[PDB]
Design a protein around this ligand. Structure first.
Ligand SMILES: CC(=O)c1ccc(O)cc1
Length: 115
């Protein structure tokens, strides 16, 4: 509270660490459904069903232009990619399984890097 400060974690390396994790996700062989925005003119249903589209190239642009205030807002956008994927794809489809695999991959890197 006012003039009563908690100790806080060193956040000076957060930007570089998030960039490294995002590079690892960009180069994963199962990243292909998530590298660019879904084409809203060509994919039936996506625009109406998915209220907040997100993809790796959009996250990369936001990270490069100072649009994440902290590392938690970055992780929210990554998780949104995989939450959208589950909403729109059957678990046993190629895209569905790719999403489950990438979520698992991300959360381990996240835990190992920051927790
Ligand atoms: C990411 C995703 O849900 C998705 C769906 C359909 C596509 O043709 C490409 C990507």
């Amino acid at each position: 509270s006012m003039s009563v400060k908690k100790p806080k974690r060193d956040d000076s390396k957060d930007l570089a660490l998030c960039s490294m994790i995002l590079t690892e996700m960009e180069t994963h062989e199962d990243a292909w459904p998530f590298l660019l925005p879904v084409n809203l003119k060509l994919v039936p249903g996506y625009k109406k069903v998915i209220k907040k589209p997100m993809d790796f190239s959009t996250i990369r642009e936001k990270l490069s232009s100072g649009q994440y205030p902290n590392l938690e807002t970055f992780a929210l956008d990554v998780r949104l990619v995989f939450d959208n994927c589950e909403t729109f794809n059957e678990d046993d489809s190629d895209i569905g399984r790719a999403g489950h695999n990438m979520r698992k991959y991300f959360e381990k890197k996240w835990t190992d890097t920051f927790k």
